[PDB]
Amino acid sequence: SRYEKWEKIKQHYQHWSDSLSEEGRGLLKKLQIPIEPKKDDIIHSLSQEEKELLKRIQIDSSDFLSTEEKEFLKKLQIDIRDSLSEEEKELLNPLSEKEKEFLKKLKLDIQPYDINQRLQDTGGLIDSPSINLDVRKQYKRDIQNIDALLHQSIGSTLYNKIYLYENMNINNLTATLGADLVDSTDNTKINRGIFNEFKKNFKYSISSNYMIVDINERPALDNERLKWRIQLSPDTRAGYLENGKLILQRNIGLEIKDVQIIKQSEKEYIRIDAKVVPKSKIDTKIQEAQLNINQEWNKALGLPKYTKLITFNVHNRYASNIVESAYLILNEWKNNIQSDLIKKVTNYLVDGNGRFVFTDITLPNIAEQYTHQDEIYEQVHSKGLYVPESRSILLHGPSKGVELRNDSEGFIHEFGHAVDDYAGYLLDKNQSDLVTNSKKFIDIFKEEGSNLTSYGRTNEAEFFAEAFRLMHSTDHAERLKVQKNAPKTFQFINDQIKFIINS
Numbered sequence: 001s002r003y004e005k006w007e008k009i010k011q012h013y014q015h016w017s018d019s020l021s022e023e024g025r026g027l028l029k030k031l032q033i034p035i036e037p038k039k040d041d042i043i044h045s046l047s048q049e050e051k052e053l054l055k056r057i058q059i060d061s062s063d064f065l066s067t068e069e070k071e072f073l074k075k076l077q078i079d080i081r082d083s084l085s086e087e088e089k090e091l092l093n094p095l096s097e098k099e100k101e102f103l104k105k106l107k108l109d110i111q112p113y114d115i116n117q118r119l120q121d122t123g124g125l126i127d128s129p130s131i132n133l134d135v136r137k138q139y140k141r142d143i144q145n146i147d148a149l150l151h152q153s154i155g156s157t158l159y160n161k162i163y164l165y166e167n168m169n170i171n172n173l174t175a176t177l178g179a180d181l182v183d184s185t186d187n188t189k190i191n192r193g194i195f196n197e198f199k200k201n202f203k204y205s206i207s208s209n210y211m212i213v214d215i216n217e218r219p220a221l222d223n224e225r226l227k228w229r230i231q232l233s234p235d236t237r238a239g240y241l242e243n244g245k246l247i248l249q250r251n252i253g254l255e256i257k258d259v260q261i262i263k264q265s266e267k268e269y270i271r272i273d274a275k276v277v278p279k280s281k282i283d284t285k286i287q288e289a290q291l292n293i294n295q296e297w298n299k300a301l302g303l304p305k306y307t308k309l310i311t312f313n314v315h316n317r318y319a320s321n322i323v324e325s326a327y328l329i330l331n332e333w334k335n336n337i338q339s340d341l342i343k344k345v346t347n348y349l350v351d352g353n354g355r356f357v358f359t360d361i362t363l364p365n366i367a368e369q370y371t372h373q374d375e376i377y378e379q380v381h382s383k384g385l386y387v388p389e390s391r392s393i394l395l396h397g398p399s400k401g402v403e404l405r406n407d408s409e410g411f412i413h414e415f416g417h418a419v420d421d422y423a424g425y426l427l428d429k430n431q432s433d434l435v436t437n438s439k440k441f442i443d444i445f446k447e448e449g450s451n452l453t454s455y456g457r458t459n460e461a462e463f464f465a466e467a468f469r470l471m472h473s474t475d476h477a478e479r480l481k482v483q484k485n486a487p488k489t490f491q492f493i494n495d496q497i498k499f500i501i502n503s
């Protein structure tokens with residue numbers, strides 16, 4: 001019975017609920033309902049020129065903000081444009097230098113106080129210098145206090161009598177597969193192929209924030225196609241939340257027991273059955289996996305066995321896929337790029353203590369970035385990233401890059417940046433730079449810069465990287481388009497590759 005179960009669990013935590021302080025309650029409420037930034041105050045704090053700038057700016061054109069930072073700026077833009085005319089509003093590409101630098105500093109002032117979000121973004125590494133220091137300390141105090149509140153386990157009586165539930169948006173786990181998981185012809189069906197890709201490498205899950213689950217399964221909203229059914233362990237700590245819900249302790253492990261396609265009210269959903277395990281159990285599987293993929297690829301690249309090249313920075317709910325997808329990504333990388341170029345460049349990265357960082361936490365919270373990027377407004381979150389100061393490639397699992405078909409296409413783009421780096425280094429080892437800053441390629445970019453992908457138009461660095469990406473696509477047509485639409489760039493990259501190999 002739904003209601004008896006609800007009552008039985010509520011009574012279990014009843015003394016706990018009654019014992020909560022006024023501070024404890026407010027803290028628990030703050031967690032469920034994050035404190036949003038005050039739009040009025042933000043807009044008021046802008047200058048007249050900055051308002052006009054924010055008013056006309058194409059927000060989606062950015063490539064360093066999060067989906068949530070973009071969503072807020074969109075709302076901020078609306079309030080700005082309100083006072084305008086009806087005809088003018090109807091009227092209202094990469095960003096200009098002026099625009100980009102403005103958004104970069106503006107993102108510092110649009111951060112909501114969201115404890116769960118901070119935990120997921122950092123994967124628990126809450127000391128990461130990706131937010132204001134004072135806010136960071138407020139988060140630490142709140143999280144520690146919440147950990148203290150959640151001291152009562154579910155019990156050895158209830159843990160195997162109850163299932164708890166969670167509806168989830170597919171884009172939470174993976175934006176890439178989420179775009180094509182629902183059948184395009186029939187919205188009520190799941191694409192059997194994509195469902196297989198999703199199901200195959202999903203064996204375990206990690207929660208670095210506090211899961212808020214339903215005691216009783218509620219019908220999914222239209223964006224929710226994932227129906228988690230969770231069984232807790234006896235010593236899993238939790239707390240009762242009003243309207244039949246439970247707040248779970250952070251840092252729990254979840255073994256994926258079964259993933260099925262089910263029908264609820266004449267529509268297909270994905271059932272994910274999970275069992276709570278000690279997180280350390282999962283972390284061991286991850287660490288063992290990292291030890292393995294490094295051994296396989298050190299040999300394959302002729303690197304010493306003790307070389308730490310590939311890093312798994314995994315802390316979130318689609319954990320196992322981040323690990324398993326890494327194999328598939330590097331396989332494609334090996335297939336579509338000549339071995340000598342790969343070895344030469346990888347050795348350069350290893351000589352700089354560089355890493356291949358595969359992660360499900362946001363890239364500003366990766367040490368390989370933030371150690372060389374003190375300024376938050378310069379910190380970038382994106383699908384992928386190359387950091388020359390650390391000689392590191394960063395690849396963010398859950399997200400989706402612009403006009404990419406897969407993660408492997410993203411990684412090759414980033415390897416392109418490393419090629420851009422090494423080649424510029426070989427030209428002048430004393431004063432190392434990027435070949436894309438050479439007068440030659442700058443002229444090539446001034447001419448052919450718009451002939452490839454839209455994103456390639458950003459700058460000479462990204463252009464080189466996009467060209468390099470398409471030159472090594474599995475699609476032969478794409479490789480030819482570069483040769484035909486940007487022949488100078490085509491030869492320029494080929495020259496660098498030869499020069500690198502012959503070095």
Ligand SMILES: Cc1cc(S(=O)(=O)N[C@H](C)C(=O)NO)ccc1F
Pocket residue numbers: 063064380382383384385386401402403404409410411413414417455462466469
């Ligand atoms: C087209 C493309 C875009 C991106 S991105 O994440 O959206 N852009 C970021 C800033 C990037 O280029 N990092 O190297 C990453 C890889 C790609 F191939």
Ligand SMILES: [Zn+2]
Pocket residue numbers: 413414417461462465
């Ligand atoms: Zn790039």
